[PDB]
Amino acid sequence: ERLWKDIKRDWLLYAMLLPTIIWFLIFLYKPMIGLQMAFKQPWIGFDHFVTLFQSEQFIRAIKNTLTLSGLSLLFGFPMPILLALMINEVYSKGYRKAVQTIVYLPHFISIVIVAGLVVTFLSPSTGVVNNMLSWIGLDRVYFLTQPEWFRPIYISSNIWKEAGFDSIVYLAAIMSINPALYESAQVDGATRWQMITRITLPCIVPTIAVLLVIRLGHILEVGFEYIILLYQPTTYETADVISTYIYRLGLQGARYDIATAAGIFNAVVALVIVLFANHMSRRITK
């Protein structure tokens, strides 16, 4: 009919789409078949769920998961927006350029190198951080062993590395606003703080909303590769997160079914929380 007619016209174009479709089927959707692993082996199943329901090590990981998700949203997410505003207000040209190169750069530093930077900085009697404390008489602290310090060390290292590169997007958004909106406001005698509150931010809101529902999409997996590297036995309590718990059991511990199932519980909620995100985003913000 219609179909067959185009399929000859676009055949070469229709060709290109296939390997990409083949790939996604094989490496993404085909593993989705393995989701039936909710039955160890020979099916069932749904029990280890209630076993995964009850663990004193697990129930704290999820308790730690959404906890870490809170602080990441609190401190981590708004910071690149802040950085974007702070850069936009910079005159002097190249000076602003200099700031951008410096601040953006840590993004390209590997996460495992970042971790290494942390362990070498926070090492007792060796690490420069402890040394600087001994200078002013703050004594010394072993940071990686203390569960108290784990999260502050993380989110601070995360905003060092990623908050600059994330600021590019917001910075690029506020650069897309026609100056007429700003110039006419200056004519009415607006102030820099008045502007960023009454025009800049409101104009950028559609951007920060979209980025938020993406941020919420991964909100349960936050800090996976960082934690898995640096988390000590003593900090196991606060540091362990569902994604980590899954890894330890899934790959290290070689327990698949209970993990894959715990994988589902993480995946569904993530798919849930992004739906509750997207709704309230599109609805209220445009």
Binding site: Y14, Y29, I33, L117
Partner: protein, 284 residues
């Protein structure tokens, strides 16, 4: 542009200072280890550095330079980055080109297929298991074809294609050019900006890629840097060989670590200007 009010001028200055302060905090660790790597083991071990190198001696670098695994693993990433990108490009660039033209029947459903993978994933273990029975474990090509297509890199590529006026394709068709030869002759050199942001994101993804590499790989000779970097840099437990080397050398563990990560980030610090040089050419 025009300066003026005090409520600005003061605000403007304290902004540049605060941002400057933040900027120094961000540049600090980079200049630190650069100095610390050059410094001497005894110096770093107690009170010194904090900014500048101290007793030099340059001895930590000699260790890593004769490390074969280091240079072995470095080679693996260069392999993985170069070929991994190309495999991604070949799977994405034409794939999005097809996805761009809305004469396709599947345009509705094929888009859903790809995009659905964004907000829902099979999970950690099922991906690994599918890697297992596909026989791709401990295999370099398994790493390459394992991660090539990203949903984001596709819809971004299709959008730039869609962004281009169809008049180019139309003009080509009027002259007789059909599809793929349109893609390579006109749409691709038109797509250079989209091509940039893609080949870049895939690049760094390969270079700094760690997890799935160390999980899917067994043979040490296939290990891609950051995996090998994990062992030495964070875990920080070493052979007696290196322990024996500590006393006969006068560099330190920390100084070696410093030198290692320096040699690790230089090519990264390298592509960054390339990256920067890249985006502001006026790109749509």
């Amino acid at each position: 542009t025009p300066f003026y009010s005090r409520s600005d001028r003061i605000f403007g200055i304290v902004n540049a200072v605060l941002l400057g302060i933040f900027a120094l905090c961000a540049l600090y660790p980079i200049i630190y280890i650069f100095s610390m790597s050059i410094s001497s083991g005894a110096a770093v071990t107690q009170g010194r550095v904090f900014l500048l190198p101290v007793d030099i001696d340059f001895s930590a670098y000699g260790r890593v330079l004769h490390d074969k695994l280091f240079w072995t693993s470095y080679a693996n990433t260069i392999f993985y980055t170069v070929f991994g990108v190309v495999t991604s490009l070949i799977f994405i660039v034409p794939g999005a080109y097809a996805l761009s033209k809305p004469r396709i029947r599947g345009r509705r459903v094929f888009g859903f297929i790809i995009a659905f993978t964004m907000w829902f994933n099979a999970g950690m273990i099922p991906f690994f298991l599918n890697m297992r029975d596909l026989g791709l474990l401990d295999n370099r090509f398994g790493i390459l074809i394992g991660f090539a297509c990203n949903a984001f890199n596709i819809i971004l590529m299709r959008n730039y294609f869609e962004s281009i006026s169809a008049s180019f394709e139309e003009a080509a068709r009027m002259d007789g050019a059909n599809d793929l030869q349109i893609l390579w002759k006109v749409y691709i050199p038109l797509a250079k900006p989209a091509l940039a942001t893609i080949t870049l994101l895939c690049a760094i993804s390969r270079w700094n890629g760690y997890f799935w590499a160390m999980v899917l790989l067994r043979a040490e000779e296939k290990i891609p840097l950051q995996v090998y970097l994990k062992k030495t840099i964070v875990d920080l437990n070493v052979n007696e060989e290196f322990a024996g080397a500590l006393l006969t050398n006068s560099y330190s563990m920390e100084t070696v670590v410093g030198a290692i990560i320096v040699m690790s980030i230089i090519p990264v610090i390298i592509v960054y200007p390339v990256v920067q040089k890249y985006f502001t050419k006026g790109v749509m």
